[PDB]
Design an enzyme around this catalytic site. Structure first.
Site, PDB file in Angstrom:
ATOM      1  N   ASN A 186       0.864  -1.228   0.000  1.00  0.00           N
ATOM      2  CA  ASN A 186       0.000   0.000   0.000  1.00  0.00           C
ATOM      3  C   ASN A 186       0.883   1.255   0.000  1.00  0.00           C
ATOM      4  O   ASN A 186       0.354   2.334   0.010  1.00  0.00           O
ATOM      5  CB  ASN A 186      -0.967   0.021   1.175  1.00  0.00           C
ATOM      6  CG  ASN A 186      -2.001  -1.087   1.180  1.00  0.00           C
ATOM      7  OD1 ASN A 186      -2.521  -1.426   2.232  1.00  0.00           O
ATOM      8  ND2 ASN A 186      -2.360  -1.624   0.034  1.00  0.00           N
ATOM      9  N   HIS A 188       2.994   2.235   2.323  1.00  0.00           N
ATOM     10  CA  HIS A 188       3.187   2.741   3.706  1.00  0.00           C
ATOM     11  C   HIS A 188       4.405   2.052   4.313  1.00  0.00           C
ATOM     12  O   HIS A 188       4.737   0.950   3.870  1.00  0.00           O
ATOM     13  CB  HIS A 188       1.920   2.458   4.533  1.00  0.00           C
ATOM     14  CG  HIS A 188       0.775   3.344   4.158  1.00  0.00           C
ATOM     15  ND1 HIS A 188      -0.130   3.799   5.087  1.00  0.00           N
ATOM     16  CD2 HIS A 188       0.398   3.888   2.968  1.00  0.00           C
ATOM     17  CE1 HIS A 188      -1.014   4.585   4.490  1.00  0.00           C
ATOM     18  NE2 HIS A 188      -0.708   4.680   3.195  1.00  0.00           N
ATOM     19  N   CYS A 223       5.590   7.059   9.750  1.00  0.00           N
ATOM     20  CA  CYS A 223       6.694   7.715   8.999  1.00  0.00           C
ATOM     21  C   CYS A 223       6.279   7.651   7.527  1.00  0.00           C
ATOM     22  O   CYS A 223       5.873   6.565   7.052  1.00  0.00           O
ATOM     23  CB  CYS A 223       8.057   7.086   9.295  1.00  0.00           C
ATOM     24  SG  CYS A 223       9.490   7.611   8.297  1.00  0.00           S
TER      25      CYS A 223
END
Ligand SMILES: CCOC(=O)NCc1ccccc1
Ligand SMILES: CCOC(=O)NCc1ccccc1
EC number: 3.1.2.14
Lengths: 265, 264
Positions: A186, A188, A223
């Site tokens: 995804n 991330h 992050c």
């Protein structure tokens, strides 16, 4: 891997790989943590998740991790088979729990356990909110309804409040950034990368003369692919304990706090 | 995993994992390169390296990679099974070669192929000397002696000379550091990390619109735990790139190579 007979839990066997192990030739805690997520995703698939219930998808909601907690008694060797059983439980309107039990395939002895707390979040706005009764109904049928805890003990280390590291920190590791291998499907940062970053402030001498026994890690914010992270460690202690802080260096925003506990080999 | 009937190659089946795939839900070339190194290690064990021959361990010698070359026709999906077969061959007293073929376990059709070049080095001094007939002869009994080549074709990508990127680079990614997950069981930076470091300077727009078809990478020198690496890329052209890895300060070359990408 496969659903147990009652279809309320899931087991999978894994062979520890050459590149999965550290200088002792046993699995690293990042490797254990990746197998915990692989078997999680395999359980999710096995019960029909194409990982969102119907109500979740109509409200653009997702499960996200608020806390991971891992206790390792033995790290399996290069070439060894480990067996991980996983299952979820409703924690009423608050969220859900996924728990794990790691065994030696050969002996059948428990070698590891892990517990994690998940909350609902809007994917678009990132706003946390409660599990609604509609969503609860929907996934409660994949969960044992009587309690089943990896950590039953009456004051176990997996539920303790964790404080903020005070500047100055005893150790630090500065300017940590993810690369494409740190990102999931995804795009991330993988939740396991945070574990690696927290451990980079442990001095090599602790790692060379000790074995990590417990890690407790809170997740505050994510992050981004273009953020840079500072990793901060202060000894708080035959057992070594530490307190941990991850923060964005572009302003000092908290992203993770945590504690580790290490016994001399 | 198991040796084939003749005992001269090794096959193994791998189930592609959640965390091993990128935004299109197929294996990264880093996943593929990790799987290649695991079947390689598993083959070494099967033929009795519990990887050093006799006289190799007596004069403190090890195999080190000079070149890795990888061509992918289809990256396996999340939950699919890639069947990889691997085998070594003697390249005389020059060095050793290790070759791979990947197939879709359900179709049996080839999905990728990989070749790698290996030379001897001491391990204390790191002087790149060559294969004697004790650090050889002892390993030919595990190799097909007639030629067997993942990349047979004369004039073919896998053997081409790569030049050195000229400053200034079109793209760069600076200040790359390995963390402990990047190290192997000997606390050297794993060879797969340099692959990740080289692709880090390819812009995201390319990764988003193309698939990597080919990667050729030379290994010149190791990156240590406290070294810092700069990653530099220039379009040479399908898109083609020239690549250079150098240490962040002095500009000590550690790796050079080239990639080749087909629009999806
Ligand atoms: C449904 C799949 O999710 C997991 O099992 N996640 C495992 C994990 C959680 C937090 C930190 C590291 C790993
Ligand atoms: C003998 C075991 O080593 C391998 O097969 N290693 C495979 C590899 C080589 C170079 C870069 C990335 C992966």
């Amino acid at each position: 891997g496969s659903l147990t007979e009652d279809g309320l839990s899931y087991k999978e066997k894994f062979v520890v790989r050459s590149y999965e192990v550290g200088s002792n030739k046993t699995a690293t805690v990042e490797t254990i943590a990746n197998l915990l997520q692989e078997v999680g995703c395999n359980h999710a698939q096995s019960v029909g998740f194409s990982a969102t219930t119907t109500t979740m998808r109509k409200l653009h909601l997702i499960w996200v991790t608020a806390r991971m907690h891992i206790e390792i008694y033995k790290y399996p060797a290069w070439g060894d088979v480990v067996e991980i059983e996983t299952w979820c439980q409703s924690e009423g309107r608050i969220g859900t729990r996924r728990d794990w039990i790691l065994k030696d395939s050969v002996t059948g002895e428990v070698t590891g356990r892990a517990t994690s707390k998940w909350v609902m979040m809007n994917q678009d706005t990132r706003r946390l909110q409660k599990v609604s009764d509609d969503v609860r109904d929907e996934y409660l049928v994949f969960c044992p309804q009587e309690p089943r805890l990896a950590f039953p003990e009456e004051n176990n280390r997996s539920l303790k409040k964790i404080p903020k590291l005070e500047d100055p920190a005893q150790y630090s590791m500065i300017g940590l950034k993810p690369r494409r291998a740190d990102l999931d499907m995804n795009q991330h940062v993988n939740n396991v990368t945070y574990i690696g970053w927290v451990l980079e402030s442990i001095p090599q001498e602790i790692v060379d003369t000790h074995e990590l026994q417990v890690i407790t890690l809170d997740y505050r914010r994510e992050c981004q692919q273009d953020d840079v992270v500072d990793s901060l460690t202060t000894t708080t202690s035959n057992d070594s304990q530490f307190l941990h802080l991850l923060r964005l260096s572009g302003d000092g925003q908290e992203i993770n706090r945590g504690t580790t506990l290490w016994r001399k080999k």
